[PDB]
Design a protein around this ligand. Structure first.
Ligand SMILES: CCCCCCCCCCCCO[C@@H]1O[C@H](CO)[C@@H](O[C@H]2O[C@H](CO)[C@@H](O)[C@H](O)[C@H]2O)[C@H](O)[C@H]1O
Ligand SMILES: CCCCCCCCCCCCO[C@@H]1O[C@H](CO)[C@@H](O[C@H]2O[C@H](CO)[C@@H](O)[C@H](O)[C@H]2O)[C@H](O)[C@H]1O
Ligand SMILES: OC[C@H]1O[C@H](O[C@H]2[C@H](O)[C@@H](O)[C@@H](O)O[C@@H]2CO)[C@H](O)[C@@H](O)[C@@H]1O
Lengths: 232, 221, 121, 232
């Protein structure tokens, strides 16, 4: 149930910030699916079942954020203005990226559908695959991912700033410090794609290939940034 | 988090019949962290601030260990500067207390002097082997240090076997935080003459006899 | 004097509290002893000397005592016999004779610290 | 209130996983009804009241799942990653089948409406009742029901795998083992329709009759599978 055996969970009691937050996460994953039209005929029913792969990817992504939220409020039981503010910024970013994720998930499901050879339906429905639009695709979703991890780092730093008020022991201080580093390291990969796309060194699709290729090398690039700080 | 925001907090607290910070000003071990926060120019900066607190009537002129402790335990002052040993008396009182990093001065941290409580055997004693038995087999043991610690806390004990229990205590974490920002005292024979030079210097500047520039002049000699 | 031999890793203090209720209802003393190597000290002492009145050990050592002639045949009435599980009586039987009273089934388990190891091997 | 007198309920305190889960179940039954259009005239008002039979069947179906969820989290009070994962898969399946159930419930209400002789409205609105479409109807809803019971079996097996951590007694171990068997036996009937429909032995509607007829013989066919394992 808990991540660390040395951590004393201050947030085992449910609070309003967590109850409100659960409503928002449930609403995000629910409206992502139920924002679709109701099938009126067999043809709509089969069309609507093609949407489960894009939705599974979106849902998997949202609960992973919900889990990190659950663990933070479980660890510190925080309920102050600044925690409320950072918590709202988080849910706000989540909410504005729910329908854009439904879009990206459908788009990539068609692109990976074409590759594997499961389907052969048109991508002209998405509009024009131009360099400017494919660059804005990276910058948009890259800015979204960066912000979510950036906010989780700020939330852990707020708990670190209140370590004495929270009576954090040497193990809990260490966990909190490690959780900040983890979230900044997670926020560093979308920040690096976003910057590469905004400068656009090649002036063509090559830029988008590199920017997209940093997510496939998430684990190794996170280890390089972690290794650079430990080597000094 | 900073020394320079205490005067503002004290103005706020004095309106509600409370002090902000009361600590032992007589013993130099308590005033040294502020004096050594920047450093000389650092000792002149740190002490002038301490002198301005007494000059602005934020702190009392003859604040000693007893009236500072009593005032904090009574619930008259919001803060105090003390060691592990002082915690048990606060627990006895009905004061929800916290132990934390010492305030920073001029951005840099206040560097307290770190002490190692140590037991020595008197050269002119016939019970040297009996004292070695007491110190080794009875005191410096998990069970022996627990007995001393439940009376008045020792701080970060030297016994390796106590590492996990010390790490489970939030106040020890704050103690180790300050100990890393400070430095261990050299054991040298001149420490006595040094401490006396700082004890007089701080009292003279606190009462209003010698100037801050003239205090470091007489202390460096 | 009623003397009982049971291993020191068992509940001899509790067995003595039963022995103390026995002396209240009869007048016989019930001392409980726990000597080291009693499984191999009983067949040497009980053969030659007096040793204990009643010996407590896992059923596996009792066949050797029964073959050597160091144990009395148990004759419990049907109503007492019926209070215990019939499979337990089979463990205390050697050559169609009941050689002891079954108390409890013991088996080793993996004891683990849930704090140091929540999902053990 | 409780199912077993020998069970010690570890989940009497409400948690985030259960709060989040309640939001999703409430949202599913709520949006099923309130995804309809608002009546603007008397004619729409009477049309909208024909939808209560299909909705009653859908709602009855969803609370039955909610009840099983309530009983599981009441029994074990689980809150770990794997329980969160299996719990998300469950809510995900629920969510993707909310609007398809609204469809099936409306379709079957018209078919049973025609039989009893209450109404005589067209089924051409649903599209073409072809063999391929009626087979995909079984396979779709059959795959949905199988997955829900399959997930409940996996959830109980996760609790069985943590029997010692949960300090389960001989009665509770027995209940947990029985709950796994119950859910696999429940998952066996939609798995058997789905397989019969996917092979399609007859190559015509006969396949769909048999596949549909296994749900009418749910109780007896569940007893046959239960009797086969006990006879050996
Ligand atoms: C890998 C294999 C899977 C590939 C799946 C690709 C899905 O791609 C997506 O399909 C759904 C099919 O309903 C389309 O969605 C369309 O129908 C749904 C049906 O309810 C309507 O809510 C929506 O208004 C409409 O856009 C998306 O516009 C298309 O982008
Ligand atoms: C057994 C007797 C009951 C038979 C009930 C059959 C109901 O069948 C169902 O009726 C509703 C009537 O609103 C239709 O529903 C129609 O009107 C509702 C009214 O709000 C709109 O939300 C929806 O866009 C539209 O599809 C369904 O498309 C039809 O399939
Ligand atoms: O005040 C100067 C004095 O400070 C230090 O003594 C500390 C002692 O180490 C602590 O354990 C505590 O009890 O307070 C003392 C100061 O009040 C130095 O160790 C000592 O040499 C010096 O005189």
């Amino acid at each position: 149930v808990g991540l660390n055996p040395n951590f004393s969970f201050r947030g085992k009691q449910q609070t309003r910030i967590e109850t409100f937050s659960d409503a928002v996460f449930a609403l995000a994953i629910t409206l992502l699916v139920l924002s679709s039209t109701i099938p009126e005929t067999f043809e709509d029913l089969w069309a609507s079942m093609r949407d489960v792969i894009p939705f599974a990817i979106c849902v998997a992504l949202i609960i992973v954020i919900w889990y990190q939220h659950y663990i933070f409020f479980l660890k510190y039981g925080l309920q102050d203005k600044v925690t409320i503010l950072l918590n709202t910024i988080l849910l706000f970013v989540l909410l504005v990226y729910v329908y854009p994720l439904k879009f990206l998930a459908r788009f990539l499901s068609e692109i990976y559908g074409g590759i594997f050879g499961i389907i052969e339906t048109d991508l002209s429905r998405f509009g024009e695959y131009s360099h400017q639009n494919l660059k804005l695709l990276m910058v948009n979703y890259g800015l979204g991912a960066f912000a979510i991890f950036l906010v989780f780092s700020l939330m852990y730093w707020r708990a670190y700033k209140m370590k004495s008020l929270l009576d954090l022991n040497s193990y809990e201080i260490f966990d909190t410090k490690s959780s900040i580093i983890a979230n900044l390291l997670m926020c560093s990969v979308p920040l690096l794609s976003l910057i590469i796309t905004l400068i656009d060194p090649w002036g063509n699709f090559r830029t988008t290939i590199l920017s997209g290729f940093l997510y496939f090398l998430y684990v190794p690039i996170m280890i390089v940034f972690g290794r650079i700080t430990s080597k000094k | 988090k900073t020394w320079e925001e205490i005067p503002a907090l004290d103005k706020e607290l004095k309106a509600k019949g409370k002090s902000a910070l009361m600590f032992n000003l007589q013993e130099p071990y308590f005033t040294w962290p502020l004096i050594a926060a920047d450093g000389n120019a650092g000792a002149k900066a740190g002490l002038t601030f301490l002198v301005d607190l007494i000059k602005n009537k934020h702190m009392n002129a003859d604040t000693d260990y007893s009236i500072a402790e009593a005032a904090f335990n009574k619930g008259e002052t919001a803060m105090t500067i003390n060691g592990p040993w002082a915690w048990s008396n606060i627990d006895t009182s009905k004061v929800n207390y916290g132990v934390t990093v010492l305030p920073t001065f001029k951005g840099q941290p206040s560097k307290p002097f770190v002490g190692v409580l140590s037991a020595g055997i008197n050269a002119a004693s016939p019970n040297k082997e009996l004292a070695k038995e007491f110190l080794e087999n009875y005191l410096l043991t998990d069970e022996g240090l627990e007995a001393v610690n439940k009376d008045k806390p020792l701080g970060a004990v030297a016994l390796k076997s106590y590492e996990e229990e010390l790490a489970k205590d939030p106040r020890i974490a704050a103690t180790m935080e300050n100990a890393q920002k400070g430095e261990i005292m050299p054991n040298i024979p001149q420490m006595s003459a040094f401490w006396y030079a700082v004890r007089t210097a701080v009292i003279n500047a606190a009462s209003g006899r010698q100037t801050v520039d003239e205090a470091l002049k007489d202390a460096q000699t | 004097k009623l003397v009982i031999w049971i291993n020191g890793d068992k509940g001899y203090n509790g067995l003595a509290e039963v022995g103390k209720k026995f002396e209240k209802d009869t007048g016989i003393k019930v001392t409980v002893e726990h000597p080291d190597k009693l499984e191999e000290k009983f067949p040497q002492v009980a053969a030659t000397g007096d040793g204990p009145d009643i010996i407590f050990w896992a059923h596996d050592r009792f066949g050797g005592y029964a073959q050597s002639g160091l144990l009395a045949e148990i004759t419990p009435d049907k109503a007492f016999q019926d209070k215990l599980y019939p499979f337990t009586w089979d463990a205390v039987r050697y050559n169609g004779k009941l050689i002891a009273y079954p108390i409890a089934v013991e088996a080793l388990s993996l004891i683990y610290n849930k704090d140091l190891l929540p999902n053990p091997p």
